[PDB]
Each structure stands twice: as structure tokens, then as C-alpha cells.
Write a protein that binds this ligand. Structure first.
Ligand code: HEM
Ligand SMILES: [Ca+2]
Ligand SMILES: [Ca+2]
Length: 306
């Protein structure tokens, strides 16, 4: 069983060391908090939160960093290396990379203005990486609501609240033009934009992402508060201003009978959203963890101990 007090005797200063690292990095890269939360998400959706995503290539297994959902997208790995080294100095061979990334995600959310809570701990690190599994398990922005629900259920998150609350991670961070080009100019081979995208916002996005333009250009997920972790993401959905297809479907899909009330509830109350987010975050953080003597306490998050 994972417990929030796991390091209270062996490394009481772990959370503060992680926080300090992120605070320092945010000065030069205001996107790092968002990037770190996403790393935890992509770690947990592939064989559980076991830091498998942090492993680099070996001749026996490929890195998850080359998965369609991570390649030229996932970022912040050097920052994780930095905090890991600092924690290793303070508490040698004690904190797993899996737990470190979990704490980093929570601290990132709090630093961005979100809720503050102590995440359950005790996870251990994987002995391998899973590229094929990452390609199969990571959801895509073009997924329909049924597909999004399928993706979450596949890893153990059955609740629509899990899906709606965790999607709130898009209250900050960036998204490449490539992922919305269809919504802007030719959605589902109709030769027309996605009808569920507010037409005024459609114009703004087309200006940022012109046809045949730079597909790697970055746009903000939340037009209201781009870097602040709050419930504005849901207010956007209510106005048909969700950035990617998967965002807007939570409110506009024909299969959204169960998600619409959740979107409204979170848009109506920060407290309601924050409570649901913490609850969902801990549930995601509880996906098939290695515990006890299973796996290792990786010294270098990029490679298995030898
Ligand atoms: C429901 C399915 C989801 C889909 C299809 C999805 C899709 C995406 C896509 C397309 C990007 C843009 C990547 C890029 O342009 O490089 C992204 C970024 C991001 N996602 Fe999601 N996501 C999902 C769920 C989540 C969840 C559960 C969290 C966290 C709890 C999350 C947190 C983030 C954050 C914070 C960013 C910004 C990262 C950065 O700016 O570096 N996403 N996501
Ligand atoms: Ca993993
Ligand atoms: Ca926001």
C-alpha cells in the first residue's frame, strides 16, 4: 500500500528539494511545471507510475521517448535529472525516480497555483521501458469521447470524473499547431472546420496556425490563464473554446451525457474541481505500482542499476 509518509524518516526534505528545483527552473522556463505534470501522466499510463518513461535507449529495449505521444513533445527530462541528483546527495539511494516524478507533478501543480496535498509514496522503478505499450496506451487529441474513455479504462481509471478532472491538466501548458490543423481547416474529411469550435476562437487559432504553416508552432491550451492552474479550462469548454478535439468532446460529444455535468460542476466551483483533481491524481498515481522489493531505487533515472 502506498503511503504519503513513506519518506518522513529516510528523506523528510525530499518534497522541499523537488519544489526548490522547480522554482529555480520556472525562472528560465515558465512551461516546466506543465511539462513535468505531463511526464507523470505519460509515466502512469504505461505499465503504471514506474518511471519507465525516464529510461533511455538500450540495445535490448527502445525508449518510450520515441512513442508517438512523446517524440518531439515530452520535455523536462534534464530537470528531473537535476532534482534526482540533488535528492541523491541529500538522501543516497532512497527516493525512487517513480516517486520523485510523482512529487514533482504535485509540486508543479501547487506552484502553478493549484491544490496542495501529500501524494502517496512507495513506488519503485521499472527494470525496462515499454515503447509499444506507450504507443498503444497514450491517448491522442483526435480520439472520440468513447476512445478517450476506453484509454482511461484500459489503464484502470473507470470513472468519468477521472477523465474530466485529469483533463484539467490542460488548464496550462502548450500544444503544437499540428494537433489542431484538422479542426481548423478540414475536420473528419468534411473540408470544413470542427463545428464544436467557437467561430471567433476559430479565427484566432487560424491566425496562429495558418494552413501550410509551422506545424511545430506552440499555442496555449487555456486562452484565459495560460500558465495558471485553475478551473478556467472548463469555462472554456462551456463556450466551445477547448483547444483540442479531446478537450471539447468532454462537453460536446454525443456520448457526453455523463461528462457534461462534471464539466459544469468544475467550471462552477474551483473547490469542486480541485478536490476532484487531487482525487483523480492519486487514483492515477496508484496505477500498477511496483512496491516493496519489486523493481529498484534507480540511481540515474535514465538507466537501470547495474
Ligand atoms: C484525455 C487525454 C489527453 C490527451 C489526448 C492529451 C493530449 C495532449 C497533447 C496533444 C498535448 C500537446 C503536446 C505537444 O504539442 O507537444 C498535451 C500537452 C499537455 N497535457 Fe495532455 N492530453 C490528455 C490528458 C492529459 C492529462 C491526464 C494530463 C495531466 C494530468 C495532461 C497534461 C498535459 C500538459 C500539462 C500539457 C502541456 C505540456 C507542456 O506544455 O510541456 N494531459 N496533451
Ligand atoms: Ca510507466
Ligand atoms: Ca489556466
Amino acid at each position: 500500500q502506498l503511503t504519503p509518509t513513506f519518506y518522513d524518516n529516510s528523506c523528510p526534505n525530499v518534497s522541499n528539494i523537488v519544489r526548490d528545483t522547480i522554482v529555480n527552473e520556472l525562472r528560465s522556463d515558465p512551461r516546466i511545471a506543465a511539462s513535468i505534470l505531463r511526464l507523470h501522466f505519460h509515466d502512469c499510463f504505461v505499465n503504471g507510475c514506474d518511471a519507465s518513461i525516464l529510461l533511455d535507449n538500450t540495445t535490448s529495449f527502445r525508449t518510450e521517448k520515441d512513442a508517438f505521444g512523446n517524440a518531439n513533445s515530452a520535455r523536462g527530462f534534464p530537470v528531473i535529472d537535476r532534482m534526482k541528483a540533488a535528492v541523491e546527495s541529500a538522501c543516497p539511494r532512497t527516493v525512487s525516480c517513480a516517486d520523485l516524478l510523482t512529487i514533482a507533478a504535485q509540486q508543479s501543480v501547487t506552484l502553478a497555483g493549484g491544490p496542495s496535498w501529500r501524494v502517496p509514496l512507495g513506488r519503485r522503478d521499472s527494470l525496462q521501458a515499454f515503447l509499444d505499450l506507450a504507443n498503444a496506451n497514450l491517448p491522442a487529441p483526435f480520439f472520440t469521447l468513447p476512445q478517450l474513455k476506453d484509454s482511461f479504462r484500459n489503464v484502470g481509471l473507470n470513472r468519468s470524473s477521472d477523465l474530466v478532472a485529469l483533463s484539467g491538466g490542460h488548464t496550462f501548458g502548450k500544444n503544437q499547431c499540428r494537433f489542431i490543423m484538422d479542426r481548423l481547416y478540414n475536420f473528419s474529411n468534411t473540408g470544413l472546420p470542427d463545428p464544436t469550435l467557437n467561430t471567433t476562437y476559430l479565427q484566432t487559432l487560424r491566425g496562429l496556425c495558418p494552413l501550410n504553416g509551422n506545424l511545430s508552432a506552440l499555442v496555449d491550451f487555456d486562452l484565459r490563464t495560460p500558465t495558471i492552474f485553475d478551473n478556467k479550462y472548463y469555462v472554456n469548454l462551456e463556450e466551445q473554446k477547448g483547444l483540442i478535439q479531446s478537450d471539447q468532446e468532454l462537453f460536446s460529444s454525443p456520448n457526453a451525457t455523463d461528462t457534461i455535468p462534471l464539466v459544469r460542476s468544475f467550471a462552477n466551483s474551483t473547490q469542486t474541481f480541485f478536490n476532484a483533481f487531487v482525487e483523480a491524481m492519486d487514483r492515477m498515481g496508484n496505477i500498477t505500482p511496483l512496491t516493496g522489493t519489486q523493481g529498484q531505487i534507480r540511481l540515474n533515472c535514465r538507466v537501470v542499476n547495474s
